[PDB]
Structures are given as C-alpha cells and as structure tokens.
Subunit: 267 residues, 4 copies
C-alpha cells in the first residue's frame, strides 16, 4: 500500500537562479541578484544596505557581487525586505551569519521570517527557507538611515501581511532620483473572499494599490523585475520599459479584480 508522500522542494524557473554581474540603477544603487530576482545593494560612506536576497541558494553569489562592488562581508550593515517569502528573503539567515548585518522589518515580516516561511497563510509549509530573526522592528512610515541615506517603509499588505515598499532618494547626473522598491501585488493561487486566515485580504489589497500609486517614484523596481517591466539581462537598457508606480498599481488591480470575479465563478 501507498507510503506517505516524499517532501517536495520549492523549485523555480531557471532564470530566477541565473547569476548576473552588478547592474547600476543609480549613483549608489546596484542590482546584484539574478536575472529574474531583484536584490538591491545601496552603498554608503558608512557601509552597505541590502534590500532582498532572492532565493536561499543565492547567498554566495550576492557576496561575490558585493566584493565586486568593493563591499566586504563585514561592510554589509543592514538587510531590508519586501516580504518574507523564500524567493526574496531566502538567504537572510546565511547572510546574517556571514556578514554581521542586522535585519529591520515590520512585525508581520518578522514573525513570518522567524518561521522560515512555514505556516504561510496560503502556502502552508510548501515554500520554506532557513528562519532568521529581525533585529529592529519598524512601523509604517518609519525612516531607517545608513551613511546618511534615508530609507522609508510604506506598508502595503496583501501579498503577505508584512509586505513593504521601501523608498529612498539616490542621484544620477547630479539630479535626485526618487527610487521606489515596491513589493509584489500578486495573489498567486490565494483564496481572496472569506479566507479565514486573512479575513480583510480584499480590503488590504485595495488600500495597497492606492499606497503604491502615491509613492514618491521617479524610478520603480519590484522583487520580480518583470512585474515593473525591467529586463536585467540587457544591461544598460534594462530600465527602458520600466513602469511607473501608477501603471504598476493599475495593472495589479485589474489582475486582482479579474481574479476575484473568476473566484466568484468557481475557477
């Protein structure tokens, strides 16, 4: 008779695991992840900040790219996160061990991070990663500063309860560039209506679309670059087709509304 099933690993498209060399986004800001997963390094006079790490197996690659940018492991001061899913916060535990960086995150992200993504509201235990602890709990609108560069958190719950957009002002050609690293707005296979683990899910998504629309936003980036129409693999032309924050929110809301109607129609 049938044995219980084997555990199944969280697998992803090859391009999500495809290393790339550092790609400059603005004067201090570099994409140092893979072709299809964002990991942003911001370099200051007093150390580096990392926003997202991608998948768990990307830890070594990120350190290699940091070294290419002149950042030794001990020079990484701070890790910030969009949300605590395996494909964005995957390597946080290993990075903390190997760099001495601290993690700052809101309470929702902190508790999910500390479970390693287990008991996810929608995924259960299917998509997990090594747990990590948040060292600083931040609140909506709170400013985290490293080397004079100020990062502001904007809560946009939905994709996870702790979903966060991070904004900061870099420069390029002597002009300020307000960067918005806006979190995911997808609801992949989620039950949207009457979800007992997330009763106000629809209300949170709706508010989060409005939050993204209003972000200070000269240049938008997203945890999955295709969501904001970036193409990291083409190098200097990677940002050419990037969406505004307005267009990113609009596309996400239209997709959400269609999914909601399909759920009412049983599919």
């Amino acid at each position: 008779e049938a044995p219980l099933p084997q555990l199944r690993a969280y697998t992803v498209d090859a391009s999500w695991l495809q290393p790339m060399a550092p790609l400059q986004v603005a004067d201090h800001t570099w994409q140092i992840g893979t072709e299809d997963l964002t990991a942003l390094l911001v370099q200051t006079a007093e150390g580096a900040v990392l926003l997202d790490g991608g998948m768990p197996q990307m830890a070594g690659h990120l350190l290699d790219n940091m070294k290419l940018r002149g950042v030794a492991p001990q020079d990484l001061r701070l890790i910030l996160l969009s949300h605590a899913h395996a494909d964005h916060a995957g390597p946080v535990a290993e990075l903390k061990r190997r760099t001495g960086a601290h993690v700052a995150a809101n309470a929702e992200t902190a508790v999910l991070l500390a479970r390693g993504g287990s008991n996810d509201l929608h995924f259960g235990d299917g998509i997990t990663y090594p747990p990590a602890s948040a060292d600083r709990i931040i609140m909506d609108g709170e400013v985290v500063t490293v080397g004079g560069i100020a990062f502001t958190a904007h809560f946009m719950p939905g994709h996870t309860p702790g979903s966060t957009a991070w904004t900061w002002t870099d420069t390029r050609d002597g002009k300020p560039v307000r960067i918005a690293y806006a979190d995911s707005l997808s609801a992949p296979g989620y039950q949207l209506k009457g979800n007992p683990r997330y009763p106000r899910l629809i209300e949170d998504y709706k508010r989060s679309f409005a939050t993204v629309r209003a972000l200070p936003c000269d240049l938008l980036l997203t945890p999955h670059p295709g969501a904001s129409n970036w193409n990291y693999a083409v190098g200097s032309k990677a940002s050419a087709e990037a969406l505004t924050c307005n267009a990113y929110a609009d596309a996400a809301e239209k997709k959400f509304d269609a999914q909601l109607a399909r759920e009412t129609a049983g599919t």
Copy 2:
C-alpha cells in the same frame, strides 16, 4: 561622585492589585481579576478561555479564582490579550507554564510579548514583564473558537500597535448578549505628532475610534474597568453605569484631541 541610578520597579495603585472574588458578567463570562484590572474567564464545554491577566503578580490569584469557578489549571485552553503591556499581559508566561494554555495574538502583540514589554515605543524599558511566546498568530477579523464559543479579533491600533478588541456572543436570561472587550484608547504621555517610532500614530488612533464605534456591542468591558465606567467592587451593580461602545470611543477621541492640541501648545 554619583553612581548610576538603581533600577526602578513598575508600581501601580493599590486597587489595581486588590483581589476580588469572581463576578459574573454573562452566562459563561466572569471577571476574575482585581478590583481595577480586568481579567475575563469564559467557560465552555471544552475548556476555559482567559482574556488578559492583569499584572505579573496576579498569576496565583487568577488560578485561585479559576478553581472557584471549577476550572483546574489544565482546563485553561487559551489566553487572548487586549495588548501586551505589563498591567494586562503581566502573568502570561507563568500562566502558560502552569496551565498548558496556548496564546493567540496578532503579530504586533506577539513581538512585544516576546520582548517582555521592553523597547516599548513610548516607555522604553521602564515597564516590563516576563516574556512569553504567542502560539497562534491571528489576523484582523479572524475567529478563534473554543467549545463552540467564537471570539473575533478587531484590530484597533494606537495604545499599542497590536491593540485588539475581542467580541463574542454570550447569553443571559435566554437572550443573546453581544460582549465587546475593547482595548485601551489612552495615549499616556505619548508623543503624538511626528513620533519617529510611530509615524502614523494619529491616523491609527483616528481609525481605531471608528472601529470601536462599529463593534457589535450589547455590553462593553475594558482592560481598565473605569474606562468603560464599570465598578467591579460593588458586585451585582458593577455594570449599571457602563458606557456604550459609542460613548467610550467619543470620550476617548475628545481626550485624544485635547491632548493633541496641548502637545502643539508645548505641554
């Protein structure tokens, strides 16, 4: 020359520490705390629920009152909290050790509970208690059920980020009684405007007044009974002067608005 100061203990008015016998609120619901701190025991066919415990030194008294109600330590199934301050969640750690109960709380309450109230947004380390872990993380509107009795969480952030109202329907004289255990709405010594640790504090308070106004509410109780005009010490007449949810929110908002104007005026 001066040595560093001694540590100072969190002290409270004597009435907050004054034991009282169990006082029935509805058919299954009892106040079993002290004269001036609420701790509600709800007794079901499949075990008891405790909402708040008061101060840390109240653990033994609560167990005594539980025994008077026929509830042995192992019969306590679940602990719920208004918010994770020393005067309401004080004895949670000891109760968990001595009863085997689980704690359910939202992510904000969970992270503050696990710090024992340390690094409080407003109090720093001045008001602390033994840390405890939440066993179940709950979301806004989520229903927690014990022995058929359904408790619904309503987030009302402000007094703490994790502040929660809990509602449930008990009975009395054959009629349903919608009980609302609404959290504190005070801002004791808080900086309200431009607080770097709580940038959206005013917006959260304002939304929380509206949340309390709309709660299902035949009978209101509050962590400090005087806030809803209860007088536990008079026994059967204790509820006579109790406020509605509408009046509790209105009084709290007027107090908040006055405090905000005083803050603008430097006091």
Copy 3:
C-alpha cells in the same frame, strides 16, 4: 551558462513513510509512527504524551492513530523529543497547532528546533523542517510528570548536542517494565576529529555510550527501530530480537571507533 542549483528536498526510504496501526509496547505505551520511525504515545488518566513524531508529513497519520487509541487532538498534553532532526521532530510545529500540546526539551534541542533544523552542525541547511518553540526547558535528570507517569531525561550528546534519552516505568502482566527510549548514537557523515563546530564531539560520544549502558532498562526502544533490533511490521513479535541498552551502546561504540579510525585513514 549554469544557473544556481535548485533546492533539494530531504527524501527518505519508503519504509520510513509507511503507516502502521498502533502497536502496544506496554500497558500505557504504544508505537503509533511508521514501520521504520518510532513515535511513542503514552496514555495517562490526565492526557497523552508523545515522544517523537517522525517526519513532517506524518502529522495526520499520528492524529489518526491517536484517535484509534481514544485520544482526541486536545487530549495530547505533552511532546518530548529524542533530538530535533527532521526525521524525528518533523511534525512538531503542526502537532502543536492542532493539539494544544506543550513541548519540553533541553536548551540545545530547543535552539535547533527553533531553527527548523537549519544551520545544523553537520548537515548545514540540507535537512530542515517547520520550526517549533519549546515551552519548557529541562535539565539533565529532570523529571516531567503527566497523569502520574514520570519521565526522566538523560542527556546523551553526540548525534546532536541536545540528544536525550527518556525513561519511564510502565507495566505489563502486573509487573513493572522500565522502558528506555534511548536516542540515536550514529554519526552519519560527521567529521569527528577537530570539528570546529563541535570540538568535544568525541568526548561527548564516549560519555554518552556510558550513559546509555547505565540507563534503567528492561525494554529498549530507539528513534530508528532497527538500531535496537525492533521489527515494528511483524506486530506482536516486534520486540523479540530487541537489544539491551548494554548491547546497543556496545554496537554503537564499535561502529564509532571504526569510523574514527577510517577518518584518520582519509575515508
């Protein structure tokens, strides 16, 4: 060019995942795991105790077997562990959520359990499971009692730093049966000499052999039943070939000594 590798799942022999009906070990003690992974249910007048859960996907099966024994989910009071590896503590998180049980474990087991087995001294992140929190920290020789049945912890570090043997006295045919649930003594692929993550590994193993030899031991069981020569699949004859504690320790030490000499010889 090559993408980074996909994550690989922890897979096991089919027999480790092969459900079995409850098999009585003594008057109150039942094997309720799979054919090749031990999970012991001890049933008292005041609730049940579970020693080990096996693999993460065994949670539902264990609850089914508990129901067959008359134990509802809420009747499980306590979970004890041999050691916090995925194949023995795998389902602890889910069991806690679904039963309200508490976990008691020593500090080493607690910290590994709370990492979900990640950053293992020998396995790294290769063999992980959903993290869980210990509710009671126990010390060497400490007695944990449920329904009058006393379980004593005997630390036997080596296989993991937190490896524990649990002993208790059951009955059979009116006579006492001193049961010893002794932890694993294997060192699967471990570096034994000069291991920077475990400098006293050899000394701990050597002491643990002596600890096992001296356990009160009328009947020995082990997390992998083949280690003590049990054959769960044959039912009433399952214990016939079981080893004494003396013989289990002797076999383990001889295997360890041979492995140590092979390590010196480069293999």
Copy 4:
C-alpha cells in the same frame, strides 16, 4: 485587606554602579565597566569585542568608554558573555540596538538571555532584564575570532547552566599574556541537593572547578572583580593581588563544600 505586593526592582551595591575610566589590562584589553562589575573591551584591527556589559543601566557608560578608546558604536563587532544574569548581561539588548554587534553564546545562555533572565532556575522572576537574542550558538571549546584575536569558550556550568569561561592571548611588553575571563562560581542562595530544576547541579559545579583549574591562565579576571581579588578603583595596581585560576577554583570549591554541609545541617 491586603493587596497583592508591588513588584520589586533588582537593586545592587552602589559600587557595582560606580562608573570608572577605562583601565588597561593588556595591550588590546581594557576594563570599561564599573568599579565592581567587569566589562572587557578587546580592540582589534577589524573592530572591538565586548565581554559582559554589567547592569542594564550601564549601556550609556560603556558606549562613552568605548568612544574614549576610539571605538565608535558601529565598531563594536561582537558581544560575548560569562552568563546571562542581569548584573552581567543587563545591557546586551540596548547595546545590540545601538551598535549592530552580534552576540555569540552557548545554547543555555541563549535561552536564558532570550527570557530576559525570567524563570531563572533559582531566582524565578526576581532578577530580570531586557531580553536579547543570540546570533551565533557556540559549542564547548569553539573558537570565535575577530581581527585575528581568537577567543575560546570553556563551558563551566553551575552558577548558571550556560556559564562560560573565555580565554585569549594578548600581549604586554612584547610577551604573550594568556588571559582567562572565568565565570562566577558562586551558588547564591541556591538549593544544591535534590534541586528538581537542576538535578546534576553538584556534579556540574565539581567538574567546573576542575575546568577552571586547567584553563590557560597567566592573568585571571572574573565578572565580579573581587572574586579574583582585583581592585579596579586603584588603577595601575588593580591587578597586583589577583588570584591564579588554581586559587580561584580552590576558594570557590571550599566555599561550595561548606555551603553544601550547611544545607545538610538545615541552614
């Protein structure tokens, strides 16, 4: 009638809270705590290490002394601990928040640190401090290295289960100085025999005396300086009367043996 008692604060002798200027112990090692509580700063080419912090209210003073030594808050890389009691690990949480340092500690110290000293085996909740998380779990004999300086952990359980001695080799006048920072060996008000929370307490103390005797030890320091006969307040003559490791262990064992006999005699 009597209300429940007020919470009582952990108070200490004034000299434990008496700031002192940095006192050099060897070429890289400085006492930067108070007159009667040790806090050792070791300064390397790649950042500073702190061994113990003393009481919770010493955080600001330690940062002041670090600045006097040329160490900015961000230059503190690592915190090590003798044991996780309020008078030695008191300010760890605040130091981590303000410096970005990581904490390394064994599993026993980690779990007590994360409880803020609550549920102490002997003190209960009477002596607590803000909880902090360990970032690196270390094993007996494990080496932690910063800026080329190697610190070795030597477990000496007794005063707490996680009690640790730390050793390292500094220099003075061109000659190596093997420093031993040996933990406390007192048992203040402890029940020694048949303690249900610590059944092997006597055996652990006895082994720990032998451990201290065998430490590499040209210069001994202790968390309470009087325990090793230091007098921090006299400056350059502070080390003159310091005990050897042999004499520290001998004095502690004689005190322990006398206390044990007194316990048998009921006092």
